[PDB]
Design a protein around this nucleic acid. Sequence first.
RNA 1: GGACCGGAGUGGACGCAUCACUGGUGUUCGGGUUGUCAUGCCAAUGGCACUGCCCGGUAGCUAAAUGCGGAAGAGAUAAGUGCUGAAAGCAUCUAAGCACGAAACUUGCCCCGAGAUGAGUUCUCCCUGACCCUUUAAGGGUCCUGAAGGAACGUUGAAGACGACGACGUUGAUAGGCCGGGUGUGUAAGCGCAGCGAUGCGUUGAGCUAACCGGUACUAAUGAACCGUGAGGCUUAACCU
RNA 2: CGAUGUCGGCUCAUCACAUCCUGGGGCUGAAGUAGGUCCCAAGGGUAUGGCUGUUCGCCAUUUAAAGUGGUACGCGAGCUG
Lengths: 56, 120, 114, 121, 209
Amino acid sequence: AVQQNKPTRSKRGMRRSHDALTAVTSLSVDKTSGEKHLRHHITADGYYRGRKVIAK
Amino acid sequence: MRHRKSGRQLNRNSSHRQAMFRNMAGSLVRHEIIKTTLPKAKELRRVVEPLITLAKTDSVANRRLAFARTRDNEIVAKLFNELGPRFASRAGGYTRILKCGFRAGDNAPMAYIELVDRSE
Amino acid sequence: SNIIKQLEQEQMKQDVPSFRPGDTVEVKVWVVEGSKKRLQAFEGVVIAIRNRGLHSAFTVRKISNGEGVERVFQTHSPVVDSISVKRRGAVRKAKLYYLRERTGKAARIKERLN
Amino acid sequence: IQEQTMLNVADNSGARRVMCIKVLGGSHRRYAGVGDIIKITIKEAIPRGKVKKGDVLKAVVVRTKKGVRRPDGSVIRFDGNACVLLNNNSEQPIGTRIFGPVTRELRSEKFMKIISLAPEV
Amino acid sequence: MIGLVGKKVGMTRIFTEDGVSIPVTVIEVEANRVTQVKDLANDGYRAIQVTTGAKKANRVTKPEAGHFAKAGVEAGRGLWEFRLAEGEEFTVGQSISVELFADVKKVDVTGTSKGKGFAGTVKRWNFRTQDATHGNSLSHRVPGSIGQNQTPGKVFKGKKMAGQMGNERVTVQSLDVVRVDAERNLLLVKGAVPGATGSDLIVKPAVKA
RNA sequence: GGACCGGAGUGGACGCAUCACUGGUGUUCGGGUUGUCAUGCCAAUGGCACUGCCCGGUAGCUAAAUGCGGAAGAGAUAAGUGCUGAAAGCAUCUAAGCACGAAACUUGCCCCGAGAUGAGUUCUCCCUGACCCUUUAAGGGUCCUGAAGGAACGUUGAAGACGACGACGUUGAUAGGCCGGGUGUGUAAGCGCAGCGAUGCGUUGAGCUAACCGGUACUAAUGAACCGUGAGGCUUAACCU
RNA sequence: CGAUGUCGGCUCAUCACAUCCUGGGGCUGAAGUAGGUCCCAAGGGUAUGGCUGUUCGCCAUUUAAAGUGGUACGCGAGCUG
């Protein structure tokens, strides 16, 4: 349940080949207010697609 | 494995799930708007809108059934007085899930769940 | 689209009578001993399920000489032809699986309104 | 039925309780409970019976709580397990009269005598 | 009289529900046609492939749409290729031939499997569980020994341990007699229609298996 | 007493699949009940007491349930039995030739399988615009166009640890909801009648009822946008150069 | 000897064939059923219990059969004591 040799910096950084953060790579621009949001999310000012869905 | 199975146990027991859902249905019927997590919102509508379609027929038996659920007479009074006839013409879909940003304390997919009301 | 649930209805038996659990029913069953084909009578309290299509059956308990025999008959099988409701019984539960265990006891009779 | 199964007896000569010591036929055959032959001992006997306590001989299972399935899907379940005592070598019933119901699958080879002596088939 | 099978099994198969399928002709009028005819130029073998069902003609990809577009654009959902007999011409005979005596003998079956997830070593192969109470520190359903100490020094390749079961193919044969009908004199074809849709086609000579 | 050879059925153990049946489980369906608290109280319900204890039980999963299977064949054979036959004018299964011969071998049956770097084949679809420096099949940068398709994202699945793999994305039944049914529990509440009362009877097979079945845009599945290009090297061989 | 945990059982096995059964032959004091021995063959299969910790061993009963060995007298970073 323990190692017998120290794994290298090559193997240590090579296990971290798949541990990289993937981006959103695209946002969506709301037609009413030109700010950008996530796909299928509120535009952080209270707008979905075409109505101000949040009064606050 | 699970096949053809419904209901998300929400990392909590059956009694707590029922109590959460009674409290959440009362909060939705009271305030017309709830910010909660996405699976909580989906199961919330799956247990709220049965009450609204129970509430179209105003009878003492249906008040007692709608009081066996959610356990609040203000909620049954609202659900049979103002809701009910406001949603009489609709056939399902008394709720709308709008997703918002993730929670600050934990990465939770949060969602505004609300009815199909108007402001005035 | 609007197709399914009729292949099981092609081979129903629409001459079946309606019975509640608790009645003592008589089931005539075809049996084959050779070239001839005769009938068998089975009496006893029925512990039924309602009509799950062709896949519906009812459980009948009889005591011959001290111990009970339970026979479940498929309702729409060709070997079961005739059911007679006979004496009609009054019980509360849909399944009499525990009231069938006791000995010397018979359910109460109710004939007016089912 | 299985090994270490206490069984009642239908025939008169077989006396009260018998217990299955081996499930005959097959290598690791575990459960044989319909018309199969089982080796029994006699665990408790009345003196009126011809057999006595501690005697090993064969049997055939006649009634079972598991119940036999008919071809149409019907299940005939008997309350309490029963057997009819047989000789070890000749495999014929010692008992002159058979008590209780029997099933129509007990018709093959030496069991026509059992269903002939039995009241209800 | 002489006449036998060719490039023909059937045209119609209905969605699976139970898997026994005692046959009865239902009255509903739809139209089905062979659409797929391959090209002639660039191949040294002349092969033909079949399809079933219907697609929306919106999620069909343009390569697949062009595949189906040779002789009439009606798409399906799947494709399966097979060998060469001779080619493709019209071999239709006269009206009524095969009504006399030689109807059917048996049929065959074909299937697929269901996904049971990352199944265990008791679910997957029928392992025996160790005794749960006489001691048994954390070893009730675990795999036991997987090898033989030092001289192998490794675990063998065909070893039964815990993994995913399901999502595979199965195949079976040889269904039997269930019931007969004689008095009303109806034309009958017999057999349980084979398995789930996703079968590989039965292209066979005379009855070997 | 008692046959190999050749057929017919029916079992034991094993393995695969399935949920139609028989069942089990079903803490999310219904009902009976004990103790107690609350909803102002009667009534009716809810909360705790392992799901309070039980009684049944839908879907799903499942075996103890059901369906199937390990073959028949073909080639080359080991042991052995042989034909023809000299060496060795007779003989001899072998040295030249030839014919049989088993659950072993190779195929036959079922799965993975072109990372088979020996990277294969077939069908279809899509792209046929310019300018500079050129340390030259040269090769790099700028503007435009960025297809077929994929990915992302939502609804999700009888697929699944995460990925992945299926179905759907408003010219939409993909998931919830709603409507009608089916199943399961077993005559709900309210009212009336009888009874001192518990309780009984009628309304009433009533009321609830899931994951199931058929239908329906009521709610969420937005239109962008992202990646992927712009005809694809050099020799050699067939129609004009 | 600056530590290679000791039997048996359970779970899981794999290999050799000096073959228990099934398969093909020879010989036999092989009339047939049934046997004995020898050759080829490792594809598959190759018990449940009472006794005491047992490997063994006795016995009841079964099966076509309950094989002999190797694998740290297989298997304790898998379990038991």
